[PDB]
Amino acid sequence: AVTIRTRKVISNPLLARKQFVVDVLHPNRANVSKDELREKLAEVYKAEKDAVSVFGFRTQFGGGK
């Protein structure tokens, strides 16, 4: 079972936008399915899957995170 964490949560009301570096830990899955992880991220935040957006991913060497 995966666990998505966030870090360096800095707000930015210049775009009314809360930006951060997200890191997912999937111990045995291949990848975390951008749509599925962004809707889980919207769930752990206030709301709006359509208004959350995560874009800069890369899976580190050896898998897992």
Binding site: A1, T3, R5, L25
Partner: protein, 437 residues
């Protein structure tokens, strides 16, 4: 009035602030507790995990499922966990339910991850009962861990550590949650979600067998490994750690004494608890009790040999000579005296008080100072003749008036090895002290 405002702040906002607030050091009389022993004949009991239902869990809707009674769970070394009612204070803990493990719980694949068999191979080590009271996890030297139901004790699920040598050595629940930090002796700390019945993350970076773990409300873990004289504090949500080492050498302690008396070096850190999210205490192999913060590496306050020194052997079983002068000289004075290296330690969370236990026959209670840089005695609890595997404290009373029940599991050998030095009349049982005001 102002007192009701203060009581509403001390309801929860102090504990979410995460500093030591529940001050009852001098408020607590000690020397007249109701110090009842209970004998249970199941062959070196090794753990105690009590569970009290917390009322109105940070909103309302009092607790989770009876309605409002406490519990305790305990673990043998011959593969038997037992569920005790403890709720009736000034009464003995009554045995309720039982679960054993035999040889038939050995699988037949035997060479992979699958330890799907529900009971236990051998040598169950320690338990932890979940704060929502649905499950109790158990785990021992058979590289599994089990979720038992808290009512019929039925193997809900079995979680293998998936390792050649991942013996589970101590479990801890993050309070008011069901995340579980298990401390596996292949130098690693595992995290599990009980309601998801899965493994969140495994976290490395230690250096020897991570033999004790503790946790509190926020996402901290404080673990100690044995033969590396260190203590790791894990902060999960940024994924980093903090390494607090020892560093008390006997020649420098002699420099601190020589202004105007025996003490010795540090074998191994053994036990931990954390008094808040900002200080924790450990107990070592030289009896030393360390009080430690977040900000410093050295000990803030290290109490010396805590439970005293073990008695030297006699004339009669040291050399086998006939003359008492030579069998006196074979004792070598005090030079081969070794301390009562402590075996369990517990701090009530956010409290002025903690307790320590070894096989000196007696629990020792300690009170931190107000400025949080020193601590001292409070008394002595002598009915626990034997080795103390684990202490847990359960409470009752009003917002200010307290009624405590200390539950110390007592065996006649240490919960990992065998390692006795003539333990004198240790009944396997539970020490249970009612202490009030």
């Amino acid at each position: 009035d102002k007192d009701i405002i203060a009581s509403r702040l001390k309801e929860d906002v102090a504990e979410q602030q995460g500093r030591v607030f529940r001050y009852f050091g001098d408020k607590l009389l000690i020397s007249e507790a109701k110090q009842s022993f209970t004998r249970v004949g199941e062959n070196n009991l090794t753990c105690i995990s009590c569970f009290q239902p917390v009322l109105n869990k940070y909103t309302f809707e009092e607790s989770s499922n009876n309605k409002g009674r406490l519990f305790a769970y305990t673990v043998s070394k011959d593969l038997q966990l037992t569920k005790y009612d403890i709720t009736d204070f000034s009464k003995r803990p009554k045995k309720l339910k039982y679960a054993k493990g035999g040889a038939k719980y050995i699988p037949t694949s035997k060479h992979e991850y699958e330890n799907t068999t529900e009971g236990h191979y051998d040598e169950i080590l320690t338990v932890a009962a979940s704060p929502d009271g649905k499950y109790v996890v158990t785990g021992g030297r058979d590289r599994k861990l089990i979720v038992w139901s808290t009512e019929s004790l039925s193997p809900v699920k079995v979680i293998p550590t998936k390792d050649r040598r991942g013996e589970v050595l101590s479990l801890a629940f993050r309070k008011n949650s069901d995340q579980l930090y298990a401390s596996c002796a292949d130098f690693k700390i595992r995290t599990y979600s009980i309601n998801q019945f899965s493994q969140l993350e495994i976290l490395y970076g230690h250096h020897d067998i991570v033999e004790d773990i503790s946790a509190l409300a926020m996402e901290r873990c404080v673990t100690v490994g044995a033969r590396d004289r260190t203590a790791m504090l894990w902060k999960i949500p940024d994924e980093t750690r903090l390494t607090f080492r020892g560093g008390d050498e006997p020649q420098k302690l002699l420099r601190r004494w020589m202004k105007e008396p025996l003490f010795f070096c540090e074998g191994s850190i053994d036990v931990v608890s954390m008094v808040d999210d900002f200080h924790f205490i450990t107990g070592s192999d030289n009896g030393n009790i360390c009080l430690w913060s977040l900000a410093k590496k050295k000990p803030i306050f290290t109490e010396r040999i805590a439970h005293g020194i073990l008695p030297e052997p006699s004339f009669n079983d040291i050399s086998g000579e006939t003359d008492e002068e030579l069998r006196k000289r074979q004792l070598q004075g005090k030079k081969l005296l070794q301390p009562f290296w402590i075996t369990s330690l517990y701090a009530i969370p956010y409290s002025n008080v903690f307790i320590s236990g070894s096989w000196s026959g007696s629990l020792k209670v300690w009170k931190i100072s107000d400025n949080l840089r020193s601590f001292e005695l409070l008394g002595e609890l002598s009915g626990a003749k034997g080795v103390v595997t684990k202490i847990q404290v359960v409470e009752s009373g009003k917002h200010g008036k307290e009624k405590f029940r200390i539950l110390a599991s007592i065996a006649k050998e240490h919960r990992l090895g065998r390692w006795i030095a003539n333990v004198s009349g240790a009944r396997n049982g539970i020490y249970s002290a009612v202490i009030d005001q």
